[PDB]
Amino acid sequence: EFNILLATDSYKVTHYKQYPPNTSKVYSYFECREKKKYEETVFYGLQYILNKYLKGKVVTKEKIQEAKDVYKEHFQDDVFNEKGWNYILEKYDGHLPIEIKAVPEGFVIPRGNVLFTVENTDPECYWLTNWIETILVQSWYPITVATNSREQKKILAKYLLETSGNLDGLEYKLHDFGYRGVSSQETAGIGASAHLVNFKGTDTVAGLALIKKYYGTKDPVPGYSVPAAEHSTITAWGKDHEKDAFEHIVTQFSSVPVSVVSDSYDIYNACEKIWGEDLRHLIVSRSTQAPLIIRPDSGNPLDTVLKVLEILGKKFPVTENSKGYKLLPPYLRVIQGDGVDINTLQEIVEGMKQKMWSIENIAFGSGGGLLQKLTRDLLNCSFKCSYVVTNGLGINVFKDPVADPNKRSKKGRLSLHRTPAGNFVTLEEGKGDLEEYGQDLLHTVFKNGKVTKSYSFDEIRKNAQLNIELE
Amino acid sequence: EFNILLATDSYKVTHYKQYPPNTSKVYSYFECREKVKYEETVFYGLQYILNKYLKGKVVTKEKIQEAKDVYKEHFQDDVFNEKGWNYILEKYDGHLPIEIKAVPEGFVIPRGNVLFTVENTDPECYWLTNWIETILVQSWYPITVATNSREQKKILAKYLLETSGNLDGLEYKLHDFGYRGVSSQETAGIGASAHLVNFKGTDTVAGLALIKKYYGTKDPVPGYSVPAAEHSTITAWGKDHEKDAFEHIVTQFSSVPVSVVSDSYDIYNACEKIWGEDLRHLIVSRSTQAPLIIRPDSGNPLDTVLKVLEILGKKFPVTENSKGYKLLPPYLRVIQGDGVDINTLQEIVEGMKQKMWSIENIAFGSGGGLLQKLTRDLLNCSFKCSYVVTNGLGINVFKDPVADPNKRSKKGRLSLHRTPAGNFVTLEEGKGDLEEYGQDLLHTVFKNGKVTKSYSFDEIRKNAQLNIEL
Ligand SMILES: O=S(=O)(c1ccc(NC(=S)NCc2cccnc2)cc1)N1CCCCC1
Ligand SMILES: O=S(=O)(c1ccc(NC(=S)NCc2cccnc2)cc1)N1CCCCC1
């Protein structure tokens, strides 16, 4: 069973001996720190953490003893605030005396702004604010996945609109392939849910249950998939029978969209000779609602996509849309799902546009790039103490390392506001109390063991929309 | 509760309809596919997956019903193999009819060798082998953390040996700071455990319970930490009282080692004037078993470490060890825990060596670099079907994409062997049966719902030792 007393960085066990004596309040904040691009971030994921790990009775006698036992061996020493944890158990029935205020989930906020704050609500528990830094900071992951996914949606939107004149089906243009490529089952669920803030297409099934349990949607599920082959289901037919494999699969899935990986042996032969000739008659007969999607999966992503389109364009009746771009017949599409990340995505759609191919023809799948190839320093997600009360006097605190101004932290009690021009500003040093900048956008989401404000996944999606969708 | 029917890539739900008719056997293997860095990998982590996710009754009526209902909406259609999963429920009390063979955990194996194989043990369950691909492939993560961690140990061993003449304390030279910097609590435990294959220092507490539950050690815990400050415990004192914080902290932890982050405002002032002058009397009085560890945390990692050492070297009595390298007194050490990954680790120790500073003086902490900044394509960890039986005939299968020879997969039934020169070789096409290369080195680790072979964490550590250690 999960034990919050064992869910922190080891050294934090020792911090109650280190703060100034007579400290009654430790107040800390989280930001995606600005760096001398990712200029705005999607705030998403805290609600999962609050419900799964922080709310309710999270301290018991048994958990205190278990922690005591582990730390004794781990430190080879008795450092451990047993009295501190006992207090929480006795006074608050094991509920955390903490208040957390946060910007609404889905909000899109420029770098360098307060996203949430944390403070103890009982003077005895000054040490608890930063005990839970470690667990709260892990919100960097769904923030970064949601943000990186949204940035890719921006690229797709721009090129889809330019080459086709609209944004139809944009929400299905980037599919989550990342399940096998992440570091754990829990990560899979979290990462997949964050991608679903921006898109509807996913094969990472774990995301669905997480959304259902922690956020909720009006619709039965937040994400969808389609039948698709893998190399095993083609190669199992044997090298000489790729055509048989292709024919069997498209016939089994005759009335729904189906994707077929076509690069097992020779992607170009597959497109030109197998799909383009031998099996052409099984393709041109398909419904617009059930296209064949040809999937290359190797080689230079841009070069391969262009060559595949060139091949298909000569075997199938291509049209020219109102924007002047080439368009495959509606029963035929392509998906590139190898080596796609935000950089290569950009390179492919720009390459397609140069060669006069509509973005309508293509979709993208991304695995490692979408859910795993990300770190906390991408957006500099960071949690820092900015205000303490010692001997009844509040003081504004911060770090400001001499060799790295990028690492300076904010001072005092913080609040987030709309500017007169409608942008965002974070007020420091309790200046939000002057009430010159309207209402604080941070809301109490957690207080004394209770989740006090929640958002549906539908609300979050609304908050995270692109401007171009809004227009 | 975990549901194995909902723990695969969506498209695999539809694969039982795509294999050739009358397929009775699907046989697949995992390798860290070949194609000068990372020439060998540490096999670690499969045992966790087998025990947590795959063994025992993993199928129930409720789980089948749940999966059916989810996939109906997810595909907007009925494609779920309800009958297949019901078969496993009724016939095997929900135990998976699968056999898995693997190299022992902790083994160090060159790239491009079979590490484990999976095949169905019931003809009705041909589809099951690749259903579980997604969960098994996640073994890439502990494999990769363990391997990258071990490669860093190799660098540290080399330079520690060169600058000091021995390897004393090597297993504490790279400390895991990665807890806040990974993607989840589960990943924290897995990754931290993987680092502990090679080292004993960690602040990622989640790794301890994982090892205790899934692997086991003779010792009470597999990993250790020491008291240390963070920025909040220094800055809380106010900008004008940095000295007061340092004094309080080292006095609270007077007889155990203690690290104190010293760069809140000015690392060089902290080292030269606060530690080096004002509080010097509290440092030189400390025990060899309870040093102060000064911790810079910003700026260019190599430049900062060198300047910190030069500062301390002028304020404290430095000696010269038998190898001719400079050594701080035993009550004083440094730890660099910012921007450390395998590349910068190399740069720092090399730079220290060039300036005649012993590696004894320094330790490293690594967070994101150790546990998060890693992907499945670093070692090309990959799972592929190599052998099927259809209509009672065995067929050797593989992929071989024309534009990428690096993606070619192995053919047929696989086995792992020792060569005459004592190396590893992977035999394909059932050739291990020819018995020209002795016994298959893979062991059956899972069969029909049961874990059939397992390793303690102590054995894994032994298997993963460096040559120089041996
Ligand atoms: O976007 S689409 O072209 C589209 C087509 C096919 C797939 N699925 C694929 S390629 N799965 C293969 C796979 C799965 C997991 C991991 N690695 C590979 C997704 C999306 N599409 C959506 C809406 C209806 C029309 C067509
Ligand atoms: O290797 S050591 O120098 C050494 C010193 C200090 C720490 N801990 C530190 S700096 N924690 C700070 C921190 C924790 C978590 C995340 N981010 C930062 C580890 C190791 N060491 C070991 C053996 C006995 C003597 C001394």
Annotate A305-317 with DSSP letters as a single string: HHHHHHHHHHHS-
Alpha helices in B75-205 (DSSP H): 82-92, 128-131, 133-137, 140-164, 185-195
Q: How far is CA B216 from CA A5, B451, B457, B458, in A?
A: 22, 16, 5, 7
CB contact under 8 A, B252 and A17: yes
- Residue A96, class by beta-carbon neighbours within 10 Å (0-12 exposed, 13-18 middle, 19+ buried)? buried
| 158-177 of B, contacting A, C-beta below 8 A | 177
Residue with tokens 């395998």: B342
d(CA A363, CA A378): 26
Dump strand ranges (E) for A83-203.
98-102, 108-110, 114-120, 174-176
SS3 of residue A425 by DSSP = strand
Closest CA to A54 of A105, A122, A104, A7: A7
Query: What are phi and psi for residue B465, nearest 5 degrees?
Result: -55, 150
Contact B125, B173 (CB under 8 A): no
Q: What is the DSSP string of B209-272?
A: HHHHHHT--SSS-S-B---B--HHHHHTT-GGGHHHHHHHHHHHTSSS-EEEE--SS-HHHIII
Give domain B138-375+455-470's CATH superfamily: Aldolase class I (3.20.20.70)
- CA A93 distance to own-chain centroid: 34
d(CA A322, CA B176): 57
Q: What is the DSSP letter of B20?
A: P
Query: What are phi and psi for residue B320, nearest 5 degrees?
Result: -125, 120
Q: What is the DSSP string of A8-60?
A: SBGGGGGGGGTSPTTEEEEEEEEEE-------EEE---HHHHIIIIISS----
Closest CA to A412 of A435, A442, A389: A389
For residue A311 and ligand 1, the question of a CB distance below 6 A is answered with no
- What is the least distance, in Å, from the CA of A323 to any CA of chain B? 33
- Residue B252, class by beta-carbon neighbours within 10 Å (0-12 exposed, 13-18 middle, 19+ buried)? middle
Contact B132, B8 (CB under 8 A): yes
Closest CA to A361 of A293, A271, A419: A293
Q: Which amino acid is at A153?
A: K
Structure tokens of B462? 């032994």
Half-sphere exposure of B47 (CA within 13 A, CB side): 23
d(CA A160, CA B371): 37
Closest CA to B290 of B251, B234, B319: B251
Residue with tokens 């947590």: B52
d(CA A374, CA A368): 9
Closest CA to A24 of B186, B262, B77, B236: B236
CB contact under 8 A, B204 and A9: yes
Q: How far is CA A144 from CA A85, A197, A337, B219, B261, in A?
A: 33, 12, 21, 39, 28
Residue A133 sits at the chain B interface (C-beta within 8 Å): yes
d(CA B121, CA B131): 14
| Distance from Cα A259 to the centre of ligand 1, integer Å | 6
d(CA A437, CA A425): 9
SS3 of residue B102 by DSSP = strand
The interaxial angle of helices B301-315 and B342-354, nearest 10 deg, is: 40
The interaxial angle of helices B185-195 and A185-195, nearest 10 deg, is: 140
Residue with tokens 């007020």: A427
Contact B415, B114 (CB under 8 A): yes
d(CA B345, CA B351): 10
- Quick one: CA torsion of A281, A284, A287, A291, rounded to 10 degrees? 100
CB contact under 8 A, B297 and A202: no
Contact A134, A73 (CB under 8 A): no
Provide, for chain A, the percentages of residues in helix, strand and coil under a 3-state DSSP scheme, each rounded to the nearest 5.
40, 20, 40
Could you count the other beta carbons within 10 Å of the beta carbon of residue A59?
Answer: 23
**Strand order of the sheet with strand B332-336?**
B174-176, B362-366, B332-336, B292-295, B258-261
d(CA A344, CA A373): 13
SS3 of residue A465 by DSSP = coil
Residue A377 sits at the chain B interface (C-beta within 8 Å): yes
| Distance from Cα B192 to the centre of ligand 2, integer Å | 15
Query: What are phi and psi for residue B107, nearest 5 degrees?
Result: -60, 140
Q: How far is CA A437 from CA A101, A104, A408, A431, B147, in A?
A: 18, 18, 24, 9, 53
Contact B7, B135 (CB under 8 A): yes
Q: What is the DSSP string of A347-416?
A: HHHHHHHHTTB-GGGEEEEESHHHHTS--TTTTTEEEEEEEEEETTEEEE-----TT-GGG----SS-EE
d(CA A371, CA A350): 23
CB contact under 8 A, B26 and A186: no
Q: How far is CA B7 from CA B54, B68, B78, B135, in A?
A: 11, 13, 18, 7
Residue of A226, A258, A262, A332 to test ligand 1 pocket, by largest number of atoms within 8 Å of CB? A226
CB contact under 8 A, A399 and B184: no
d(CA B432, CA B429): 8
Q: Which residues of B touch A368 (CB under 8 A)?
A: 375-377
CB contact under 8 A, B183 and A183: yes
Alpha helices in A165-263 (DSSP H): 185-195, 206-214, 231-235, 242-252
- The bound ligand whose nearest atom lies closest to the alpha carbon of A172 is 1
d(CA A19, CA A447): 23
d(CA A102, CA A118): 9
Structure tokens of A457? 């996944």
d(CA B8, CA B13): 8
Residue with tokens 């008659």: A281
The reply to whether CATH 3.40.50.970 applies to domain A138-375+455-471 is no
Q: Which residue of A has its CA nearest to B74?
A: A224
Residue A201 sits at the chain B interface (C-beta within 8 Å): no
d(CA A245, CA A238): 9
Q: Which residues of A touch B229 (CB under 8 A)?
A: 11, 15, 18
For residue A370 and ligand 1, the question of a CB distance below 6 A is answered with no
Using the atom order of ligand 1, give the atom closest to the CA of residue A334: 3
d(CA A216, CA A341): 29
Contact A139, A42 (CB under 8 A): no
**What is the resolution in angstroms?**
1.9
| 46-75 of B, contacting A, C-beta below 8 A | 53, 70, 73-75
d(CA A245, CA A241): 6
d(CA A18, CA A37): 38
Please tell me the residue having the least CA distance from ligand 2 atom 24: B257
d(CA A391, CA A396): 14
A69 annotated as belonging to a binding site for a ligand = no
Contact A424, A29 (CB under 8 A): no
**Strand order of the sheet with strand B450-451?**
B393-396, B381-390, B23-32, B114-120, B98-102, B443-447, B450-451
Nearest 5°: CA angle at A232, between A227 and A236?
115
Looking only at the bridges linking them, the beta strands covering A40-42 and A108-110 are antiparallel
d(CA A210, CA A410): 34
Residue of A262, A293, A371 to test ligand 1 pocket, by largest number of atoms within 8 Å of CB? A293
Domain boundaries, chain B: 1-137+376-454, 138-375+455-470
CB contact under 8 A, B184 and A138: yes
Looking only at the bridges linking them, the beta strands covering B424-427 and B332-336 are unpaired
Residue of B293, B332, B345, B371 to test ligand 2 pocket, by largest number of atoms within 8 Å of CB? B293
